[PDB]
């Protein structure tokens, strides 16, 4: 269990992320802390180009390697996309590419910014005695003034944490199935349903803290990758680390272990078959920290909650199971509405979206198809 690096309070998010690196990495830290200015005034690229190659060995624990991932990943996005107006670098300079690749290998993560970087590790309490609420939180790194990264990253994080309340119930679910404890099972499912329902309310804050124009035309540009991306159709050259350019997807909540873990728990077969949706979500596992990916693997290897509940002729159980599925449908439905507002409308207003809506609708529909009764 401790092997899975799941926090009782923050779930898959990294508890108390670190904010400073050893003095030895000030050169990295200074660029990452000043990205809005450096990018805007056109100093970012030359600074990166002028860095000495720093060794990764003075990053001695997990939290500090994670902070360096976040730093280097942000710097890399800034360097590749520049001011975010379509002029793009195709080579990442060795003095940054080499340690970032080394560090990424060590953490078993791709050398690009992932969800686990810019959400799960990218946050702090303002006041350590107050609760984890938006007003008491901040992010550690942004790209551009006005990019709304704080609102986008924190509200993801807050959803992620609300859903974590349910994660701790999962061992109860499996124990109750093996012990044939019917009332314990039912209570456990109603409790998962309740947390996933809470996570929806938390989603509503996206409208308060993120503005569609700034999201669509700025933040989205900095989070994009180089896989199947025509601005970088062969990927990115990690100078000095690989000979050939490599492709990696940009940061995506398809990399959240939260939603993937409930789809597995409930037997919603999100990654089955060979369609586009299933493959993208299977591929996104390779972007999750290894401990969380081992967690998903071990969920798949347990007996099926859905089969258990379907074989019992127990309406109470059926309805508790359906309330879990329905909570996921509701969340995915609200999310589709958000995408219409934050991507589809802004895109239509500028002087593709159908493949995106269809991907999301396929995932929602596969979730709906899992309802036992129809509700």
Q: Which is nearer to ligand PIM, 115 or 262 (CB)?
A: 115
Choices 17-25, 131-139, 311-319, 355-363 (CB under 6 A): range interacting with ligand HEM? 355-363
Among residues 238, 254, 318, 319, the one that binds ligand HEM under rule CB under 6 A: 254
Give exposure, 257-290, as e/b (b: 16+ Cβ within 10 Å).
bbbbbbbbbbbbebbeeeeebbebbeebbebbbe
The interface with ligand HEM within residues 323-342 (CB under 6 A) comprises: 332, 335, 338-339, 342
Binding partner of residue 118 among ligand PIM, ligand HEM, none, CB cut-off 5 to 8 Å per kind: ligand PIM
**Distance in angstroms (rounded) separating the CA atoms of residues 372 and 304:** 14
CB of 157 to ligand PIM, least distance (A): 8
Under the binding rule (CB under 6 A), the answer on residue 156 touching ligand PIM is yes
CB of 239 to ligand PIM, least distance (A): 26
Long-range contacts of 123-131 (CB under 8 A, 24+ apart): 123/13, 123/17, 123/153, 123/154, 123/157, 124/17, 124/19
CB of 191 to ligand HEM, least distance (A): 20
Q: Which is nearer to ligand PIM, 22 or 146 (CB)?
A: 146
Q: Could you give phi then psi for residue 123, rounded to 5 degrees? A: -155, 160
**Distance in angstroms (rounded) separating the CA atoms of residues 166 and 103:** 32
Look up residue 190 and give its two tokens. 């109603």
**Distance in angstroms (rounded) separating the CA atoms of residues 262 and 258:** 7
Closest CA to 110 of 297, 285, 292, 239: 285
Among residues 117, 160, 319, 322, the one that binds ligand HEM under rule CB under 6 A: 160
Site residues (CB under 6 A) for ligand HEM? Answer: 155-156, 159-160, 203, 206, 210, 215, 252-254, 256, 259, 332, 335, 338-339, 342-343, 356, 360, 363
What does the binding site for ligand PIM look like in residue numbers (CB under 6 A)? 115, 118-119, 152-153, 156, 223, 251-253
């Amino acid at each position: 269990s401790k092997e899975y690096h799941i926090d009782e309070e923050v779930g898959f998010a990294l508890p108390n992320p670190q904010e400073n690196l050893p003095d030895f990495y000030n050169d990295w830290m200074f660029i990452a802390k000043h990205l809005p200015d450096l990018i805007e005034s056109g100093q970012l690229r030359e600074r990166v180009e002028k860095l000495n190659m720093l060794s990764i060995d003075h990053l001695t624990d997990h939290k500090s390697q994670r902070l360096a991932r976040l730093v280097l990943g942000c710097i890399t996005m800034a360097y590749v996309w520049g001011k975010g107006h379509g002029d793009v670098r195709k080579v990442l300079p060795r003095n940054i590419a080499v340690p970032y690749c080394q560090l990424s290998k060590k953490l078993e993560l791709p050398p690009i910014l992932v969800y686990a970087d810019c959400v799960l590790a990218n946050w702090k309490k303002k006041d350590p005695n107050k609760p984890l609420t938006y007003e008491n939180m901040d992010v550690l790194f942004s790209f551009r003034d006005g990019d709304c990264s704080k609102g986008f990253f924190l509200v993801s994080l807050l959803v992620e944490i609300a859903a974590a309340s349910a994660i701790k119930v999962i061992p109860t679910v499996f124990k109750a199935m093996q012990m044939q404890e019917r009332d314990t099972l039912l209570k456990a499912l109603l409790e998962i349903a309740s947390c996933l329902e809470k996570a929806l309310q938390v989603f509503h804050q996206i409208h308060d803290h993120v503005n569609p124009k700034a999201f669509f035309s700025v933040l989205r540009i900095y989070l994009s990758g180089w896989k199947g991306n025509p601005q970088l159709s062969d990927g990115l050259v990690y100078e000095g680390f690989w000979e050939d350019p490599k492709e990696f997807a940009g940061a995506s909540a398809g990399q959240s272990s939260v939603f993937q873990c409930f789809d597995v728990l409930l037997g919603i077969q999100q990654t089955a078959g060979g369609g586009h949706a299933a493959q993208f979500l299977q591929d996104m596992r390779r972007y999750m920290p290894p401990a969380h990916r081992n967690f998903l693997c071990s969920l798949e290897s347990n007996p099926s909650v859905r089969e258990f509940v379907l074989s019992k002729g127990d309406a109470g159980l059926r309805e508790a199971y359906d309330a879990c599925v329905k909570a996921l449908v509701s969340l995915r439905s609200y999310h589709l509405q958000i995408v219409t507002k934050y991507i589809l409308i802004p895109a239509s207003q500028q002087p593709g979206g159908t493949d995106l809506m269809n991907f999301l609708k396929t995932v929602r529909s596969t979730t709906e198809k899992s309802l036992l009764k129809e509700g």
